[PDB]
Design a protein around this motif. Structure first.
Motif, PDB file in Angstrom:
ATOM      1  N   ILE A  33       0.856  -1.158   0.000  1.00  0.00           N
ATOM      2  CA  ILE A  33       0.000   0.000   0.000  1.00  0.00           C
ATOM      3  C   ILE A  33       0.898   1.215   0.000  1.00  0.00           C
ATOM      4  N   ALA A  34       0.821   2.014  -1.066  1.00  0.00           N
ATOM      5  CA  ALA A  34       1.655   3.204  -1.202  1.00  0.00           C
ATOM      6  C   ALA A  34       0.840   4.498  -1.051  1.00  0.00           C
ATOM      7  N   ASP A  35       1.378   5.433  -0.279  1.00  0.00           N
ATOM      8  CA  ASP A  35       0.694   6.680  -0.003  1.00  0.00           C
ATOM      9  C   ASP A  35       0.768   7.760  -1.104  1.00  0.00           C
ATOM     10  N   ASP A  36       1.482   7.481  -2.187  1.00  0.00           N
ATOM     11  CA  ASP A  36       1.448   8.336  -3.365  1.00  0.00           C
ATOM     12  C   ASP A  36       1.753   7.543  -4.618  1.00  0.00           C
ATOM     13  N   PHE A  37       1.396   8.115  -5.767  1.00  0.00           N
ATOM     14  CA  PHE A  37       1.449   7.352  -7.002  1.00  0.00           C
ATOM     15  C   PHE A  37       2.894   7.200  -7.513  1.00  0.00           C
ATOM     16  N   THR A  38       3.747   8.205  -7.294  1.00  0.00           N
ATOM     17  CA  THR A  38       5.137   8.059  -7.722  1.00  0.00           C
ATOM     18  C   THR A  38       5.839   6.989  -6.848  1.00  0.00           C
ATOM     19  N   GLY A  39       5.541   7.013  -5.551  1.00  0.00           N
ATOM     20  CA  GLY A  39       6.062   6.027  -4.612  1.00  0.00           C
ATOM     21  C   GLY A  39       5.656   4.592  -4.922  1.00  0.00           C
ATOM     22  N   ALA A  40       4.416   4.396  -5.361  1.00  0.00           N
ATOM     23  CA  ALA A  40       3.994   3.104  -5.859  1.00  0.00           C
ATOM     24  C   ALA A  40       4.911   2.611  -7.005  1.00  0.00           C
ATOM     25  N   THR A  41       5.214   3.477  -7.988  1.00  0.00           N
ATOM     26  CA  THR A  41       6.065   3.044  -9.100  1.00  0.00           C
ATOM     27  C   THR A  41       7.505   2.764  -8.642  1.00  0.00           C
ATOM     28  N   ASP A  42       7.992   3.562  -7.704  1.00  0.00           N
ATOM     29  CA  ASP A  42       9.325   3.424  -7.095  1.00  0.00           C
ATOM     30  C   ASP A  42       9.436   2.050  -6.453  1.00  0.00           C
ATOM     31  N   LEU A  43       8.528   1.749  -5.532  1.00  0.00           N
ATOM     32  CA  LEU A  43       8.462   0.409  -4.940  1.00  0.00           C
ATOM     33  C   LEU A  43       8.331  -0.726  -5.968  1.00  0.00           C
ATOM     34  N   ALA A  44       7.390  -0.622  -6.906  1.00  0.00           N
ATOM     35  CA  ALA A  44       7.219  -1.663  -7.884  1.00  0.00           C
ATOM     36  C   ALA A  44       8.510  -1.844  -8.696  1.00  0.00           C
ATOM     37  N   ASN A  45       9.184  -0.754  -9.017  1.00  0.00           N
ATOM     38  CA  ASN A  45      10.459  -0.851  -9.732  1.00  0.00           C
ATOM     39  C   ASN A  45      11.473  -1.714  -8.969  1.00  0.00           C
ATOM     40  N   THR A  46      11.627  -1.429  -7.682  1.00  0.00           N
ATOM     41  CA  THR A  46      12.521  -2.195  -6.833  1.00  0.00           C
ATOM     42  C   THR A  46      12.131  -3.655  -6.752  1.00  0.00           C
ATOM     43  N   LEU A  47      10.836  -3.935  -6.632  1.00  0.00           N
ATOM     44  CA  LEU A  47      10.393  -5.325  -6.611  1.00  0.00           C
ATOM     45  C   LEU A  47      10.655  -6.055  -7.936  1.00  0.00           C
ATOM     46  N   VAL A  48      10.339  -5.415  -9.067  1.00  0.00           N
ATOM     47  CA  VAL A  48      10.577  -6.030 -10.366  1.00  0.00           C
ATOM     48  C   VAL A  48      12.061  -6.289 -10.574  1.00  0.00           C
ATOM     49  N   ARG A  49      12.884  -5.311 -10.218  1.00  0.00           N
ATOM     50  CA  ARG A  49      14.324  -5.431 -10.420  1.00  0.00           C
ATOM     51  C   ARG A  49      14.946  -6.500  -9.547  1.00  0.00           C
ATOM     52  N   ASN A  50      14.243  -6.894  -8.485  1.00  0.00           N
ATOM     53  CA  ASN A  50      14.741  -7.928  -7.594  1.00  0.00           C
ATOM     54  C   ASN A  50      13.969  -9.232  -7.699  1.00  0.00           C
ATOM     55  N   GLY A  51      13.214  -9.382  -8.789  1.00  0.00           N
ATOM     56  CA  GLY A  51      12.729 -10.679  -9.203  1.00  0.00           C
ATOM     57  C   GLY A  51      11.285 -10.993  -8.862  1.00  0.00           C
ATOM     58  N   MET A  52      10.452  -9.990  -8.571  1.00  0.00           N
ATOM     59  CA  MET A  52       9.025 -10.269  -8.342  1.00  0.00           C
ATOM     60  C   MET A  52       8.167  -9.611  -9.419  1.00  0.00           C
ATOM     61  N   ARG A  53       7.411 -10.416 -10.164  1.00  0.00           N
ATOM     62  CA  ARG A  53       6.469  -9.861 -11.125  1.00  0.00           C
ATOM     63  C   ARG A  53       5.486  -9.008 -10.325  1.00  0.00           C
ATOM     64  N   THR A  54       5.309  -7.761 -10.742  1.00  0.00           N
ATOM     65  CA  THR A  54       4.526  -6.815  -9.968  1.00  0.00           C
ATOM     66  C   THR A  54       3.500  -6.116 -10.821  1.00  0.00           C
ATOM     67  N   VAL A  55       2.288  -5.963 -10.286  1.00  0.00           N
ATOM     68  CA  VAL A  55       1.265  -5.131 -10.907  1.00  0.00           C
ATOM     69  C   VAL A  55       0.889  -3.982  -9.968  1.00  0.00           C
ATOM     70  N   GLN A  56       0.850  -2.769 -10.512  1.00  0.00           N
ATOM     71  CA  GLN A  56       0.424  -1.603  -9.751  1.00  0.00           C
ATOM     72  C   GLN A  56      -1.017  -1.288 -10.123  1.00  0.00           C
ATOM     73  N   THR A  57      -1.881  -1.171  -9.118  1.00  0.00           N
ATOM     74  CA  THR A  57      -3.263  -0.796  -9.348  1.00  0.00           C
ATOM     75  C   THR A  57      -3.473   0.619  -8.856  1.00  0.00           C
ATOM     76  N   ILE A  58      -4.370   1.336  -9.513  1.00  0.00           N
ATOM     77  CA  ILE A  58      -4.717   2.672  -9.097  1.00  0.00           C
ATOM     78  C   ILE A  58      -5.940   2.500  -8.227  1.00  0.00           C
ATOM     79  N   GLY A  59      -5.746   2.596  -6.911  1.00  0.00           N
ATOM     80  CA  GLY A  59      -6.778   2.204  -5.975  1.00  0.00           C
ATOM     81  C   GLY A  59      -7.136   0.755  -6.182  1.00  0.00           C
TER      82      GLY A  59
END
Ligand SMILES: Nc1ncnc2c1ncn2[C@@H]1O[C@H](COP(=O)(O)OP(=O)(O)O)[C@@H](O)[C@H]1O
Length: 420
Positions: free
Chosen positions: A7-33
């Protein structure tokens, strides 16, 4: 099923986190709400899910309510561990929302402890004796003391977090973290026994972040910036739960929408202007007088065959002047609304590439665009990935946290998103 729910408190932060997860080997989907079923497609196939909220500066009761709804949705998708993601500069006020949300999530998970670690060495954030540093400057001497919405005047994160928390805040100090995962996990057990319900975690390096991730393998909830997620995929791999594991260029019209007032964003705007690229500045005072500023920005963009920059980005003194006249929240929301209207208008006109500077700004813009979910592409700058929507004709977005990116980021982003 998905393993990690965020759960990310802003939309840029959501992409930042998802980037880190993808780069470290977890397929990630970001949902808007929260997506309607089954409005987002191959979602039960993700390893990690990141729910983007615009909850960093709304009232605490609303942030909690939105965060609890997201938590339940994530649990129902099958997630086993949860991350609460907030800014690496701890963006908040004494009224919230880091404390109220973390504590609410712990209660709903029936857990008595989490860590709070906004460290992000790749972007110059470290934590020592609970004090947050940006490069060699304390937080409150870094420029964050002049943030338009959440000025950070205290670098002591234990004191800052305690002020917005009902329960005891403590410290997981660098000297335990330095001793490795086993020692760190032992110190966590001692803190819990001491009655600490949330501990600021020191981290002076990426090595410390991996140590913390491993030490927290057994916690239902982990909180922080994107750095604290670095080591979470490895936990699942080690546990036998996750096997060891792009996006196409989108051509068409682009635009840069800048609502951050950060030094980095000021520098990015200046560079754009230095290179003679078309730009129009938004005057919040004109917005408040009801002058047709969004219409003018649309007309400006429509008359140019190349991307334009629409920006409210200003110096701290200029922001302070606007705020004295209009109020902090009113000025901030007029600007967000304007940029969001420009984005919606441009979408209707065929614009396909959007570079947005600012967390709240990105929340406003992406909501106005009607985006339901994002696929994470390649990193453009630390903390900032290229992304695309899942439409038949996708949009390509770069959602840049205000403090992130180099001077040349706007051009770098536009080019990575796709061709002309
Ligand atoms: N010139 C200005 N006057 C008043 N408020 C402004 C001005 N420029 C930007 N803002 C507001 O400051 C806030 C910046 O927050 P955000 O977009 O989250 O940026 P960041 O990622 O840098 O924190 C927004 O609400 C924005 O509309």
């Amino acid at each position: 099923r998905p393993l990690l729910g965020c759960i990310a408190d802003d939309f840029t932060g959501a992409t930042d986190l998802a980037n880190t997860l993808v780069r470290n080997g977890m397929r990630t989907v970001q949902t808007i709400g929260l997506p309607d079923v089954g409005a987002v497609q191959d979602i039960g196939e993700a390893d990690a899910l990141v729910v983007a909220l615009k909850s960093r500066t709304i009232p605490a009761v609303e942030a909690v309510a939105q965060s609890l709804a997201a938590l339940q949705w994530l649990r129902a998708q099958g997630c086993r561990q949860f991350v609460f993601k907030y800014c690496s500069t701890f963006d908040s006020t004494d009224a919230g929302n880091i404390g109220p949300v973390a504590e609410a999530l712990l209660a709903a998970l029936d857990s008595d402890f989490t860590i709070a670690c906004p460290a992000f060495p790749e972007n110059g954030r470290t934590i020592f004796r609970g004090h947050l540093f940006v490069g060699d400057a304390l937080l409150n001497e870094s420029g964050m003391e002049h943030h338009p919405l959440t000025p950070m005047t205290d670098a002591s994160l234990v004191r800052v977090l305690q002020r917005q928390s009902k329960n005891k805040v403590g410290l997981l100090r660098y000297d335990a973290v330095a001793r490795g995962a086993h020692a760190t996990a032992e110190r966590i057990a001692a803190l819990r026994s001491d009655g600490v319900r949330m501990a600021i975690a020191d981290a002076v390096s990426d090595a410390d972040l991996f140590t913390l991730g491993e030490a927290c393998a057994n916690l239902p909830l982990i909180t922080g910036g994107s750095g604290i997620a670095l080591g979470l995929p490895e936990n699942f791999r080690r546990a036998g739960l996750l096997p060891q594991r792009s996006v196409p260029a989108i051509d068409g019209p682009g635009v840069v929408l800048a609502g951050s007032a950060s030094r980095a964003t000021n520098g990015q705007v200046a560079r754009w202007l230095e290179q003679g690229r078309p730009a129009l500045r938004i005057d919040p005072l004109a917005l408040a007088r009801g002058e047709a500023v969004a219409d003018a920005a649309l007309a400006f963009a429509a008359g140019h065959g190349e991307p334009v920059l629409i920006y409210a980005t200003s110096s701290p003194d200029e922001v302070k002047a606007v705020q004295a006249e209009l109020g902090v929240e009113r000025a901030g929301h007029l600007v967000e609304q304007c940029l969001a209207t420009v984005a919606a208008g441009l979408l209707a006109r065929g614009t396909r590439r959007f570079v947005v500077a600012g967390g709240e700004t990105s929340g406003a813009v992406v909501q106005a665009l009607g985006v339901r979910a994002l696929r994470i592409g390649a990193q453009i700058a630390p903390g900032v990935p290229a992304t695309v929507t899942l439409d038949a004709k996708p949009l390509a977005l770069a959602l840049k946290s205000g403090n992130f990116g180099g001077p040349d980021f706007f051009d770098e982003a536009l080019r990575q998103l796709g061709g002309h």
